[PDB]
Amino acid sequence: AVIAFGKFKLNLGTREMFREDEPMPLTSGEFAVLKALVSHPREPLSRDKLMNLARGREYSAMERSIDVQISRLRRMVEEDPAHPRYIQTVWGLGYVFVPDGSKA
């Protein structure tokens, strides 16, 4: 279902994410993008497959952005876009989502 954290809060079903209360809109592209990652936990996929997955039917076949999107996504989830937690960007791979942390 939705994805909430100790402080952060996210929900695809409602497409509403916030941290502590700060309401943040997640456009199709964004949500779809993240959703993709939230669709496959611990699954490293290339930047292409990233937007690709998000690029299904809904209006997500135009906003070709992942590096800029992810970065922004890594922020909302992690105030500090340097030391994330549920976002493990791999240059070799692409973008993996390891919740809590186990093995990149």
Side-chain angles (χ1 to χ4, degrees):
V2 320
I3 299 89
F5 308 67
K7 293 154 160 267
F8 318 103
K9 286 227 207 166
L10 174 132
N11 170 2
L12 307 178
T14 306
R15 191 239 251 87
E16 275 233 271
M17 164 181 194
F18 29 100
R19 179 216 116 272
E20 209 223 283
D21 156 37
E22 256 262 277
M24 317 231 252
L26 279 153
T27 200
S28 277
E30 286 166 69
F31 156 32
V33 156
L34 178 117
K35 184 257 118 220
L37 268 144
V38 163
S39 217
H40 304 302
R42 197 223 183 170
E43 244 142 292
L45 296 128
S46 222
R47 322 100 124 284
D48 253 288
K49 302 275 126 95
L50 260 290
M51 46 154 303
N52 193 108
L53 213 168
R55 179 189 113 71
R57 254 126 104 184
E58 64 230 82
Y59 161 59
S60 171
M62 252 262 132
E63 187 90 272
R64 273 133 208 173
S65 254
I66 255 292
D67 157 48
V68 55
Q69 231 110 108
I70 295 276
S71 42
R72 282 242 169 180
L73 295 153
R74 267 166 81 272
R75 214 203 218 164
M76 53 178 45
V77 307
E78 304 261 324
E79 199 185 285
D80 306 66
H83 247 143
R85 208 193 192 86
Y86 299 82
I87 303 290
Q88 269 218 82
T89 287
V90 185
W91 317 121
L93 267 283
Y95 295 95
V96 77
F97 195 93
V98 171
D100 213 307
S102 57
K103 182 178 145 126

XYZ file of all heavy atoms in Angstrom:
834
model
N 0.841 -1.185 0.000
C 0.000 0.000 0.000
C 0.885 1.248 0.000
O 1.963 1.249 -0.591
C -0.946 -0.044 1.202
N 0.395 2.281 0.670
C 1.128 3.533 0.754
C 2.507 3.273 1.364
O 2.796 2.159 1.800
C 0.314 4.565 1.536
C -1.168 4.488 1.165
C 0.510 4.391 3.044
N 3.322 4.317 1.377
C 4.662 4.215 1.929
C 4.904 5.381 2.889
O 5.063 6.522 2.457
C 5.696 4.117 0.804
C 5.465 2.868 -0.048
C 7.120 4.173 1.363
C 4.494 3.159 -1.195
N 4.927 5.055 4.172
C 5.148 6.060 5.196
C 6.414 5.712 5.982
O 6.756 4.539 6.128
C 3.913 6.154 6.093
N 7.075 6.752 6.466
C 8.296 6.572 7.234
C 8.155 7.164 8.637
O 7.103 7.700 8.986
C 9.406 7.317 6.489
C 9.526 6.941 5.011
C 8.528 7.266 4.146
C 10.627 6.281 4.563
C 8.638 6.916 2.772
C 10.736 5.931 3.192
C 9.741 6.256 2.324
N 9.229 7.047 9.406
C 9.237 7.564 10.764
C 8.816 9.034 10.794
O 8.275 9.508 11.791
N 9.082 9.715 9.688
C 8.737 11.122 9.575
C 8.081 11.375 8.216
O 7.037 12.022 8.137
C 9.964 11.997 9.837
C 10.418 11.882 11.293
C 11.913 12.179 11.427
C 12.273 12.548 12.867
N 12.231 14.015 13.052
N 8.719 10.850 7.181
C 8.210 11.012 5.829
C 6.924 10.205 5.627
O 6.697 9.211 6.315
C 9.285 10.479 4.879
C 10.710 10.875 5.270
C 11.531 9.967 5.863
C 11.157 12.137 5.022
C 12.854 10.335 6.225
C 12.479 12.505 5.385
C 13.301 11.597 5.978
N 6.119 10.664 4.681
C 4.862 9.998 4.382
C 4.614 10.045 2.873
O 4.735 11.101 2.252
C 3.726 10.599 5.210
C 3.814 10.152 6.670
C 2.450 9.685 7.185
C 2.340 9.884 8.699
N 0.931 9.757 9.135
N 4.271 8.886 2.326
C 4.005 8.782 0.901
C 2.846 7.810 0.674
O 2.633 6.896 1.470
C 5.280 8.408 0.144
C 5.112 8.118 -1.349
C 6.159 8.870 -2.174
C 5.141 6.613 -1.624
N 2.129 8.038 -0.417
C 0.997 7.193 -0.759
C 0.679 7.350 -2.247
O 0.373 8.449 -2.707
C -0.248 7.593 0.035
C -1.492 6.882 -0.503
O -1.433 6.084 -1.423
N -2.619 7.217 0.120
N 0.765 6.236 -2.958
C 0.490 6.237 -4.385
C -1.024 6.254 -4.610
O -1.520 6.993 -5.459
C 1.200 5.066 -5.068
C 2.704 4.953 -4.816
C 3.285 3.718 -5.505
C 3.428 6.235 -5.234
N -1.714 5.431 -3.833
C -3.161 5.343 -3.938
C -3.802 6.729 -3.850
O -4.858 6.965 -4.435
N -3.137 7.610 -3.117
C -3.629 8.967 -2.947
C -2.664 9.968 -3.585
O -2.963 11.158 -3.668
C -3.852 9.205 -1.452
O -4.698 8.131 -1.053
C -4.683 10.458 -1.177
N -1.527 9.448 -4.021
C -0.516 10.282 -4.649
C -0.277 11.545 -3.820
O -0.350 12.658 -4.339
C -0.933 10.682 -6.066
C 0.230 11.329 -6.819
C -0.131 12.745 -7.273
N -0.316 12.775 -8.742
C -1.484 12.507 -9.363
N -2.583 12.190 -8.647
N -1.535 12.563 -10.681
N -0.001 11.331 -2.542
C 0.248 12.438 -1.634
C 1.403 12.102 -0.690
O 1.293 11.191 0.131
C -1.016 12.798 -0.850
C -1.902 13.757 -1.648
C -2.244 15.000 -0.825
O -3.302 14.900 -0.094
O -1.520 16.008 -0.894
N 2.484 12.856 -0.836
C 3.658 12.648 -0.005
C 3.984 13.902 0.807
O 3.838 15.020 0.316
C 4.852 12.288 -0.889
C 6.168 12.438 -0.123
S 7.544 12.044 -1.189
C 8.843 11.887 0.026
N 4.418 13.676 2.038
C 4.765 14.773 2.925
C 5.725 14.310 4.023
O 5.785 13.124 4.339
C 3.465 15.256 3.569
C 2.402 14.165 3.720
C 2.226 13.551 4.920
C 1.636 13.811 2.655
C 1.240 12.537 5.061
C 0.650 12.799 2.795
C 0.473 12.184 3.995
N 6.451 15.272 4.574
C 7.403 14.976 5.630
C 7.098 15.818 6.872
O 7.463 16.990 6.938
C 8.836 15.259 5.175
C 9.835 14.976 6.298
C 10.990 15.980 6.271
N 10.979 16.796 7.507
C 10.285 17.946 7.649
N 9.537 18.425 6.631
N 10.348 18.592 8.796
N 6.429 15.185 7.826
C 6.069 15.861 9.061
C 4.710 16.550 8.913
O 4.026 16.798 9.903
C 7.149 16.861 9.474
C 7.184 17.034 10.993
C 7.320 18.510 11.375
O 8.507 18.999 11.243
O 6.331 19.142 11.775
N 4.363 16.840 7.667
C 3.099 17.496 7.376
C 3.199 18.212 6.028
O 2.210 18.329 5.307
C 2.762 18.540 8.442
C 1.821 19.654 7.983
O 0.886 19.419 7.201
O 2.079 20.821 8.466
N 4.404 18.675 5.729
C 4.647 19.378 4.480
C 4.085 18.578 3.304
O 4.655 17.562 2.909
C 6.140 19.657 4.289
C 6.465 21.123 4.583
C 6.536 21.939 3.291
O 7.661 21.871 2.664
O 5.554 22.597 2.919
N 2.942 19.081 2.762
C 2.297 18.425 1.638
C 3.064 18.678 0.339
O 3.276 19.825 -0.048
C 0.886 18.988 1.612
C 0.935 20.271 2.425
C 2.239 20.283 3.202
N 3.463 17.586 -0.298
C 4.204 17.676 -1.545
C 3.518 16.869 -2.649
O 3.304 15.666 -2.503
C 5.625 17.145 -1.334
C 6.206 17.652 -0.013
S 7.818 18.369 -0.292
C 8.849 17.112 0.443
N 3.182 17.583 -3.757
C 2.524 16.946 -4.887
C 3.511 16.098 -5.689
O 4.654 16.502 -5.903
C 1.932 18.092 -5.692
C 2.671 19.342 -5.244
C 3.421 19.008 -3.965
N 3.035 14.937 -6.113
C 3.862 14.027 -6.888
C 3.210 13.790 -8.252
O 2.342 12.929 -8.389
C 4.127 12.742 -6.102
C 5.236 12.815 -5.051
C 5.001 11.797 -3.933
C 6.615 12.651 -5.696
N 3.655 14.569 -9.228
C 3.126 14.454 -10.576
C 3.235 13.010 -11.072
O 3.953 12.203 -10.484
C 3.868 15.457 -11.461
O 3.010 15.629 -12.587
C 5.152 14.876 -12.057
N 2.510 12.732 -12.145
C 2.516 11.399 -12.725
C 3.957 10.924 -12.931
O 4.332 9.850 -12.462
C 1.754 11.372 -14.052
O 0.349 11.237 -13.856
N 4.723 11.747 -13.631
C 6.112 11.424 -13.905
C 6.853 11.060 -12.618
O 7.437 9.979 -12.516
N 6.809 11.979 -11.664
C 7.471 11.767 -10.388
C 6.929 10.505 -9.714
O 7.656 9.526 -9.547
C 7.307 12.986 -9.478
C 8.190 14.143 -9.951
C 7.783 15.455 -9.274
O 8.046 15.522 -8.012
O 7.242 16.353 -9.936
N 5.659 10.567 -9.346
C 5.012 9.440 -8.693
C 5.290 8.138 -9.445
O 5.721 7.152 -8.849
C 3.507 9.716 -8.713
C 2.644 8.455 -8.629
C 3.086 7.371 -7.938
C 1.433 8.418 -9.249
C 2.285 6.202 -7.861
C 0.632 7.249 -9.172
C 1.075 6.166 -8.480
N 5.033 8.176 -10.745
C 5.250 7.010 -11.584
C 6.701 6.545 -11.438
O 6.961 5.354 -11.276
C 4.890 7.349 -13.032
N 7.606 7.509 -11.502
C 9.024 7.213 -11.379
C 9.275 6.484 -10.059
O 9.716 5.335 -10.054
C 9.841 8.499 -11.517
C 11.202 8.362 -10.833
C 10.004 8.890 -12.987
N 8.987 7.182 -8.970
C 9.176 6.615 -7.645
C 8.429 5.284 -7.553
O 9.024 4.257 -7.226
C 8.769 7.624 -6.568
C 8.869 7.136 -5.122
C 9.890 7.959 -4.335
C 7.495 7.133 -4.448
N 7.139 5.342 -7.850
C 6.306 4.153 -7.804
C 7.077 2.972 -8.396
O 7.071 1.877 -7.835
C 4.962 4.414 -8.489
C 4.034 3.206 -8.352
C 3.980 2.406 -9.654
C 4.498 0.982 -9.446
N 5.312 0.550 -10.605
N 7.726 3.234 -9.522
C 8.503 2.207 -10.195
C 9.493 1.591 -9.205
O 9.589 0.368 -9.095
C 9.198 2.810 -11.418
N 10.207 2.465 -8.511
C 11.187 2.023 -7.534
C 10.471 1.311 -6.384
O 10.969 0.319 -5.855
C 12.062 3.194 -7.083
C 13.355 3.408 -7.871
C 13.666 4.898 -8.020
C 14.517 2.641 -7.238
N 9.311 1.848 -6.031
C 8.521 1.278 -4.951
C 7.810 0.019 -5.457
O 7.183 -0.697 -4.679
C 7.556 2.328 -4.399
C 6.448 1.672 -3.574
C 8.303 3.379 -3.577
N 7.932 -0.210 -6.756
C 7.311 -1.367 -7.374
C 8.261 -2.566 -7.316
O 7.820 -3.714 -7.337
C 6.914 -1.073 -8.822
O 5.686 -1.701 -9.179
N 9.547 -2.256 -7.247
C 10.562 -3.293 -7.185
C 11.643 -2.896 -6.178
O 12.612 -2.225 -6.533
C 11.129 -3.583 -8.578
C 10.083 -3.969 -9.597
N 9.237 -5.052 -9.429
C 9.756 -3.407 -10.796
C 8.441 -5.128 -10.486
N 8.765 -4.108 -11.333
N 11.435 -3.337 -4.909
C 12.380 -3.033 -3.848
C 13.641 -3.889 -3.975
O 13.558 -5.113 -4.072
C 11.616 -3.287 -2.558
C 10.435 -4.163 -2.938
C 10.300 -4.132 -4.452
N 14.780 -3.212 -3.969
C 16.057 -3.894 -4.083
C 16.274 -4.382 -5.517
O 16.919 -5.406 -5.738
C 16.130 -5.090 -3.129
C 17.576 -5.548 -2.933
C 17.677 -7.074 -2.964
N 19.071 -7.493 -2.696
C 19.446 -8.769 -2.461
N 18.530 -9.763 -2.459
N 20.718 -9.031 -2.235
N 15.721 -3.624 -6.453
C 15.844 -3.966 -7.860
C 16.493 -2.815 -8.631
O 15.826 -1.839 -8.973
C 14.484 -4.330 -8.460
C 14.461 -5.786 -8.923
C 13.101 -6.431 -8.638
O 12.748 -6.641 -7.468
O 12.402 -6.716 -9.684
N 17.820 -2.970 -8.889
C 18.565 -1.955 -9.615
C 18.234 -1.992 -11.107
O 18.447 -3.007 -11.769
C 20.026 -2.256 -9.321
C 20.065 -3.692 -8.830
C 18.641 -4.113 -8.501
N 17.719 -0.872 -11.595
C 17.359 -0.765 -12.998
C 18.019 0.479 -13.597
O 18.221 1.475 -12.903
C 15.838 -0.792 -13.162
C 15.139 -2.085 -12.737
C 13.989 -1.795 -11.772
C 14.678 -2.886 -13.956
N 18.339 0.380 -14.879
C 18.972 1.483 -15.579
C 18.053 2.708 -15.569
O 16.859 2.589 -15.299
C 19.325 1.096 -17.017
O 20.610 1.577 -17.400
N 18.646 3.855 -15.868
C 17.893 5.098 -15.898
C 16.786 5.025 -16.951
O 15.761 5.693 -16.826
C 18.806 6.286 -16.209
C 20.163 6.131 -15.517
C 21.221 5.614 -16.494
N 22.368 6.549 -16.540
C 22.355 7.729 -17.197
N 21.256 8.128 -17.871
N 23.436 8.486 -17.172
N 17.031 4.207 -17.964
C 16.067 4.038 -19.038
C 14.849 3.280 -18.509
O 13.716 3.742 -18.647
C 16.665 3.228 -20.191
C 16.995 4.038 -21.446
O 15.974 4.436 -22.124
O 18.172 4.276 -21.759
N 15.120 2.129 -17.913
C 14.060 1.302 -17.362
C 13.297 2.098 -16.301
O 12.126 1.828 -16.041
C 14.626 -0.025 -16.850
C 15.335 -0.787 -17.970
C 14.343 -1.625 -18.777
C 14.446 -1.308 -20.271
N 15.337 -2.277 -20.945
N 13.995 3.060 -15.716
C 13.399 3.896 -14.688
C 12.170 4.602 -15.261
O 11.040 4.303 -14.875
C 14.441 4.852 -14.104
C 15.052 4.442 -12.763
C 14.025 4.556 -11.634
C 15.660 3.040 -12.844
N 12.429 5.529 -16.174
C 11.358 6.280 -16.804
C 10.464 5.362 -17.644
O 9.279 5.636 -17.820
C 11.955 7.370 -17.697
C 13.095 6.814 -18.551
S 13.270 7.784 -20.041
C 11.620 7.628 -20.707
N 11.071 4.294 -18.140
C 10.346 3.335 -18.958
C 9.165 2.781 -18.158
O 8.012 2.924 -18.568
C 11.243 2.160 -19.353
C 10.599 1.331 -20.466
O 11.022 1.348 -21.610
N 9.557 0.606 -20.070
N 9.490 2.161 -17.034
C 8.469 1.584 -16.176
C 7.376 2.624 -15.921
O 6.194 2.348 -16.118
C 9.098 1.029 -14.896
C 8.423 -0.206 -14.298
C 9.291 -0.833 -13.204
C 7.017 0.127 -13.793
N 7.810 3.799 -15.490
C 6.883 4.881 -15.207
C 6.129 5.249 -16.486
O 5.023 5.786 -16.429
C 7.648 6.069 -14.619
N 6.757 4.945 -17.613
C 6.161 5.237 -18.905
C 5.308 4.057 -19.374
O 5.733 3.280 -20.228
C 7.235 5.531 -19.954
C 6.604 5.811 -21.320
C 7.675 5.896 -22.411
N 7.523 4.766 -23.355
C 6.510 4.650 -24.241
N 5.551 5.596 -24.311
N 6.475 3.599 -25.038
N 4.120 3.958 -18.796
C 3.204 2.885 -19.145
C 2.074 3.399 -20.040
O 2.201 3.408 -21.263
N 0.993 3.811 -19.394
C -0.158 4.325 -20.116
C -0.397 5.793 -19.759
O -0.465 6.648 -20.640
C -1.416 3.517 -19.792
C -1.797 2.605 -20.959
C -1.940 1.153 -20.498
N -3.373 0.792 -20.399
C -3.823 -0.395 -19.940
N -2.957 -1.347 -19.534
N -5.126 -0.611 -19.896
N -0.521 6.041 -18.462
C -0.751 7.391 -17.978
C 0.215 8.370 -18.649
O 1.228 7.958 -19.215
C -0.626 7.455 -16.455
C 0.795 7.110 -16.007
C 0.781 6.045 -14.908
O 0.682 4.847 -15.208
O 0.877 6.503 -13.706
N -0.133 9.645 -18.568
C 0.691 10.685 -19.159
C 2.078 10.718 -18.517
O 2.327 11.519 -17.616
C -0.025 12.005 -18.874
C 0.871 13.239 -18.998
C 1.503 13.515 -20.194
C 1.048 14.076 -17.915
C 2.347 14.677 -20.311
C 1.890 15.239 -18.034
C 2.498 15.481 -19.226
O 3.296 16.577 -19.338
N 2.944 9.843 -19.003
C 4.299 9.764 -18.487
C 5.280 9.482 -19.628
O 6.385 8.997 -19.394
C 4.415 8.682 -17.409
O 5.770 8.447 -17.034
N 4.839 9.802 -20.834
C 5.664 9.591 -22.012
C 6.011 10.944 -22.636
O 5.653 11.214 -23.780
C 4.931 8.669 -22.990
N 6.705 11.759 -21.855
C 7.106 13.078 -22.315
C 8.177 13.676 -21.401
O 9.171 14.224 -21.878
C 5.886 13.999 -22.347
C 5.453 14.289 -23.785
S 6.106 15.865 -24.313
C 6.777 15.405 -25.900
N 7.938 13.552 -20.105
C 8.870 14.075 -19.119
C 10.049 13.116 -18.943
O 10.081 12.331 -17.996
C 8.168 14.332 -17.783
C 9.103 15.039 -16.801
C 8.991 16.560 -16.938
O 9.774 17.087 -17.818
O 8.192 17.190 -16.230
N 10.990 13.211 -19.871
C 12.169 12.362 -19.830
C 13.189 12.916 -18.831
O 14.108 13.637 -19.215
C 12.821 12.259 -21.211
C 12.190 11.133 -22.031
C 11.849 11.609 -23.445
N 10.706 10.835 -23.978
C 10.085 11.107 -25.145
N 10.493 12.140 -25.914
N 9.073 10.348 -25.524
N 12.992 12.556 -17.573
C 13.882 13.008 -16.518
C 13.939 11.966 -15.399
O 12.904 11.521 -14.905
C 13.433 14.361 -15.959
O 14.276 15.424 -16.393
N 15.161 11.606 -15.032
C 15.367 10.625 -13.980
C 16.469 11.115 -13.039
O 16.315 11.068 -11.819
C 15.641 9.244 -14.582
C 14.421 8.333 -14.443
C 16.896 8.620 -13.971
C 14.161 7.982 -12.976
N 17.554 11.576 -13.641
C 18.682 12.075 -12.870
C 18.251 13.317 -12.091
O 18.627 13.490 -10.933
C 19.842 12.471 -13.786
C 20.817 13.488 -13.191
O 21.282 13.336 -12.052
O 21.101 14.485 -13.959
N 17.466 14.153 -12.757
C 16.980 15.375 -12.139
C 15.783 15.047 -11.243
O 15.584 15.684 -10.210
C 16.655 16.411 -13.216
C 15.665 15.848 -14.238
C 16.121 17.703 -12.593
N 15.017 14.054 -11.672
C 13.846 13.634 -10.924
C 14.266 12.906 -9.644
O 13.823 13.256 -8.552
C 12.932 12.756 -11.779
C 11.489 13.262 -11.740
C 11.079 13.857 -13.087
O 10.301 13.287 -13.836
N 11.644 15.032 -13.354
N 15.118 11.907 -9.824
C 15.602 11.126 -8.699
C 16.184 12.068 -7.643
O 15.745 12.067 -6.494
C 16.585 10.054 -9.175
C 15.888 9.029 -10.072
C 17.290 9.392 -7.989
C 15.194 7.953 -9.236
N 17.164 12.852 -8.070
C 17.810 13.797 -7.176
C 16.760 14.516 -6.325
O 16.898 14.602 -5.107
C 18.643 14.814 -7.957
O 17.974 15.262 -9.133
N 15.733 15.009 -7.002
C 14.659 15.714 -6.324
C 13.883 14.757 -5.418
O 13.379 15.159 -4.371
C 13.696 16.350 -7.328
C 14.278 17.642 -7.905
C 13.393 18.843 -7.560
N 14.102 20.101 -7.882
C 13.579 21.333 -7.699
N 12.336 21.480 -7.195
N 14.301 22.389 -8.022
N 13.811 13.508 -5.854
C 13.104 12.489 -5.096
C 13.932 12.109 -3.867
O 13.380 11.837 -2.802
C 12.752 11.303 -5.992
C 11.762 11.586 -7.125
C 11.973 10.620 -8.292
C 10.320 11.560 -6.612
N 15.243 12.102 -4.055
C 16.153 11.758 -2.976
C 16.134 12.846 -1.899
O 16.493 12.593 -0.752
C 17.583 11.588 -3.494
C 17.868 10.127 -3.847
C 19.148 10.003 -4.676
N 20.332 10.048 -3.789
C 20.950 11.186 -3.410
N 20.503 12.385 -3.838
N 22.001 11.109 -2.613
N 15.711 14.033 -2.309
C 15.641 15.159 -1.395
C 14.404 15.041 -0.502
O 14.519 15.000 0.722
C 15.586 16.485 -2.157
C 16.312 17.590 -1.386
C 15.810 18.972 -1.810
N 16.939 19.931 -1.843
C 16.897 21.126 -2.471
N 15.782 21.520 -3.123
N 17.963 21.903 -2.437
N 13.249 14.990 -1.149
C 11.992 14.876 -0.429
C 12.051 13.749 0.604
O 11.551 13.897 1.718
C 10.858 14.602 -1.420
C 11.189 13.404 -2.314
S 9.829 13.076 -3.422
C 9.456 14.738 -3.957
N 12.666 12.649 0.196
C 12.797 11.496 1.073
C 13.940 11.740 2.060
O 13.864 11.331 3.219
C 12.983 10.226 0.243
C 11.878 10.088 -0.806
C 14.367 10.197 -0.413
N 14.975 12.404 1.566
C 16.133 12.706 2.391
C 16.514 14.181 2.250
O 17.104 14.581 1.247
C 17.312 11.800 2.033
C 16.921 10.324 2.140
C 17.401 9.725 3.465
O 18.485 10.081 3.949
O 16.603 8.859 3.991
N 16.161 14.950 3.269
C 16.457 16.373 3.273
C 17.864 16.622 2.725
O 18.113 17.641 2.084
C 16.304 16.961 4.677
C 16.155 18.484 4.619
C 16.123 19.086 6.025
O 15.106 18.968 6.726
O 17.202 19.691 6.385
N 18.748 15.673 2.999
C 20.124 15.778 2.542
C 20.335 14.834 1.356
O 20.424 13.620 1.534
C 21.103 15.377 3.646
C 20.927 16.125 4.968
O 19.817 15.890 5.585
O 21.805 16.892 5.391
N 20.413 15.443 0.143
C 20.612 14.669 -1.071
C 22.060 14.188 -1.183
O 22.724 14.433 -2.188
C 20.208 15.600 -2.202
C 20.240 17.004 -1.618
C 20.313 16.877 -0.105
N 22.506 13.510 -0.136
C 23.863 12.990 -0.102
C 23.874 11.652 0.640
O 24.476 10.685 0.175
C 24.789 14.023 0.541
N 23.204 11.640 1.783
C 23.130 10.439 2.594
C 21.676 9.976 2.696
O 21.002 10.244 3.688
C 23.775 10.667 3.963
C 25.043 9.878 4.183
N 26.129 10.380 4.881
C 25.390 8.616 3.793
C 27.078 9.457 4.902
N 26.617 8.364 4.226
N 21.223 9.270 1.624
C 19.860 8.765 1.583
C 19.697 7.550 2.497
O 20.494 7.344 3.411
C 19.604 8.446 0.118
C 20.975 8.342 -0.532
C 21.992 8.932 0.430
N 18.656 6.777 2.219
C 18.377 5.587 3.007
C 17.566 4.586 2.183
O 17.936 3.417 2.079
C 17.604 5.937 4.278
C 17.887 4.924 5.388
C 16.881 5.069 6.532
N 17.331 4.285 7.704
C 18.178 4.752 8.647
N 18.675 6.003 8.562
N 18.514 3.965 9.653
N 16.474 5.079 1.617
C 15.606 4.242 0.806
C 15.845 4.488 -0.685
O 14.998 4.159 -1.515
C 14.177 4.653 1.158
C 13.811 4.445 2.629
C 14.179 5.386 3.570
C 13.113 3.318 3.014
C 13.836 5.190 4.954
C 12.769 3.124 4.399
C 13.148 4.069 5.301
O 12.823 3.884 6.608
N 17.002 5.061 -0.980
C 17.363 5.354 -2.357
C 18.864 5.131 -2.544
O 19.679 5.860 -1.983
C 16.898 6.759 -2.745
C 15.386 6.910 -2.550
C 17.327 7.106 -4.171
C 14.615 6.077 -3.576
N 19.184 4.119 -3.337
C 20.575 3.789 -3.607
C 20.864 3.894 -5.105
O 20.725 2.917 -5.838
C 20.919 2.397 -3.078
C 21.434 2.468 -1.638
C 22.567 1.465 -1.410
O 23.720 1.708 -1.730
N 22.177 0.328 -0.840
N 21.260 5.090 -5.516
C 21.571 5.335 -6.914
C 22.900 4.678 -7.289
O 23.929 4.955 -6.674
C 21.556 6.848 -7.143
O 20.173 7.191 -7.109
C 22.001 7.232 -8.556
N 22.836 3.819 -8.296
C 24.022 3.119 -8.760
C 24.304 3.512 -10.212
O 23.477 3.286 -11.093
C 23.848 1.612 -8.572
C 25.127 0.861 -8.945
C 23.417 1.284 -7.141
N 25.478 4.093 -10.416
C 25.880 4.520 -11.746
C 25.967 3.276 -12.634
O 25.444 3.268 -13.747
C 27.189 5.311 -11.695
C 27.257 6.330 -10.556
C 28.147 6.394 -9.557
C 26.356 7.436 -10.337
N 27.889 7.455 -8.714
C 26.764 8.109 -9.203
C 25.232 7.854 -11.072
C 26.107 9.241 -8.705
C 24.587 8.985 -10.561
C 24.986 9.674 -9.422
N 26.632 2.258 -12.108
C 26.793 1.012 -12.839
C 25.435 0.429 -13.235
O 25.233 0.043 -14.386
N 24.541 0.382 -12.260
C 23.207 -0.148 -12.492
C 22.300 0.972 -13.002
O 22.074 1.094 -14.206
C 22.680 -0.843 -11.235
C 22.940 -2.348 -11.140
C 21.974 -3.128 -12.034
C 24.401 -2.673 -11.454
N 21.801 1.763 -12.062
C 20.922 2.868 -12.402
C 20.285 3.467 -11.146
O 20.742 4.494 -10.643
N 19.241 2.801 -10.678
C 18.536 3.255 -9.489
C 17.884 2.081 -8.757
O 17.026 1.398 -9.313
C 17.441 4.202 -9.986
C 17.972 5.477 -10.644
C 18.116 5.537 -12.015
C 18.310 6.566 -9.866
C 18.616 6.737 -12.634
C 18.809 7.766 -10.485
C 18.938 7.793 -11.838
O 19.411 8.926 -12.423
N 18.316 1.884 -7.520
C 17.785 0.804 -6.705
C 17.140 1.390 -5.447
O 17.539 2.456 -4.979
C 18.890 -0.208 -6.394
C 19.825 0.318 -5.304
C 18.297 -1.562 -6.001
N 16.153 0.669 -4.935
C 15.450 1.105 -3.742
C 15.582 0.071 -2.620
O 14.850 -0.918 -2.593
C 13.973 1.246 -4.119
C 13.143 2.027 -3.099
C 12.968 3.367 -3.249
C 12.579 1.381 -2.043
C 12.196 4.092 -2.303
C 11.808 2.107 -1.097
C 11.633 3.447 -1.247
N 16.519 0.335 -1.723
C 16.756 -0.559 -0.602
C 16.283 0.111 0.689
O 16.960 0.990 1.220
C 18.231 -0.965 -0.558
C 18.556 -1.712 0.737
C 18.605 -1.802 -1.784
N 15.092 -0.340 1.169
C 14.521 0.205 2.387
C 15.257 -0.319 3.621
O 15.498 -1.519 3.742
C 13.057 -0.201 2.352
C 12.967 -1.346 1.357
C 14.263 -1.380 0.566
N 15.595 0.607 4.509
C 16.298 0.253 5.729
C 17.791 0.111 5.429
O 18.620 0.750 6.074
C 15.799 -1.083 6.285
C 15.825 -1.198 7.811
O 16.862 -0.971 8.451
O 14.705 -1.543 8.350
N 18.088 -0.729 4.448
C 19.468 -0.960 4.055
C 19.900 -2.390 4.392
O 19.753 -2.834 5.528
N 20.426 -3.068 3.382
C 20.880 -4.437 3.557
C 22.128 -4.686 2.709
O 23.200 -4.974 3.242
C 19.782 -5.435 3.190
O 19.324 -5.254 1.851
N 21.950 -4.566 1.401
C 23.048 -4.774 0.473
C 22.705 -4.131 -0.871
O 21.728 -4.513 -1.515
C 23.390 -6.263 0.373
C 24.573 -6.492 -0.570
C 24.942 -7.976 -0.637
C 25.420 -8.359 -2.039
N 26.749 -9.005 -1.974
N 23.526 -3.165 -1.256
C 23.321 -2.465 -2.512
C 23.372 -3.469 -3.666
O 23.455 -3.079 -4.829
C 24.365 -1.357 -2.655
